[PDB]
Amino acid sequence: SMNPPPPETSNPNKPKRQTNQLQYLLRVVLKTLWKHQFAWPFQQPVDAVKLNLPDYYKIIKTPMDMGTIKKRLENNYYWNAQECIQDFNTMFTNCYIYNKPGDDIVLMAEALEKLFLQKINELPTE
Ligand SMILES: CO[C@H]1CC[C@H](n2c([C@@H]3CCCC(=O)N3c3ccc(F)c(F)c3)nc3cc(-c4c(C)noc4C)ccc32)CC1
């Protein structure tokens, strides 16, 4: 099987706005997770061809990753902060769907998710 194309990251037909919460999601939340020791597997779409995982995209139909999330933020793809938070959650739960619970990559995603939730609790008002 081929890989699917990556998720859309820009849509000129979607309205665009800057908000304090979206800026925080980019400049603090995403940046902190990006620099975490376990970030590398989550920095781009899963290359199931390279990883020899022919069933990945048979099981995962809503792929999401931090490279896509960051591009979405940079392209003003999200109107509401909750849309971005949803994509982070999708990334984590995809890992928990595809992989067996004791697997190293699941433990790594759990560590990233714990830090994510801490940073989301510091989201500013507005
Ligand atoms: C830019 O090149 C990429 C970097 C991440 C590489 N990678 C790796 C590399 C190569 C394969 C073996 C290995 O140990 N990897 C690795 C290497 C260094 C790390 F710091 C690390 F956390 C993992 N493992 C990946 C696992 C996943 C994954 C996700 C997310 N959900 O389910 C699975 C399976 C995704 C990517 C993985 C694949 C090539």
Numbering used by the authors: 42 to 167
What text comes from the article?
Many proteins, including the EP300/CBP histone acetyltransferases (HATs), contain several targetable domains. Using crystallography, we identify the binding mechanism of the EP300/CBP-specific BRD inhibitor CCS1477 in complex with the EP300, CBP and BRD4 BRDs, and define components of the CCS1477 catalytic binding core that are required for compound activity.
As expected, CCS1477 binds through canonical hydrogen-bonding interactions of its dimethyl isoxazole moiety with a conserved asparagine residue in the acetyl-lysine (Kac) binding site (CBPN1168, EP300N1132, BRD4N140). Additionally, the BRD4 binding pocket contains a WPF shelf that imposes steric hindrance on CCS1477 such that the side chain of BRD4W81 undergoes a conformational change to accommodate the difluorophenyl moiety. Superposition of CCS1477 as bound in the respective Kac sites reveals an altered binding pose, reflecting the reduced shape complementarity between CCS1477 and BRD4, as compared with EP300/CBP. Further analysis of the binding energies by isothermal titration calorimetry (ITC) confirmed significantly stronger interaction of CCS1477 with the bromodomains of CBP and EP300 (Kd = 4.0 and 26 nM, respectively) than with BD1 of BRD4 (Kd = 403 nM). At supraphysiologic high doses (10μM), biotin-CCS1477 interacted with EP300 and BRD4.
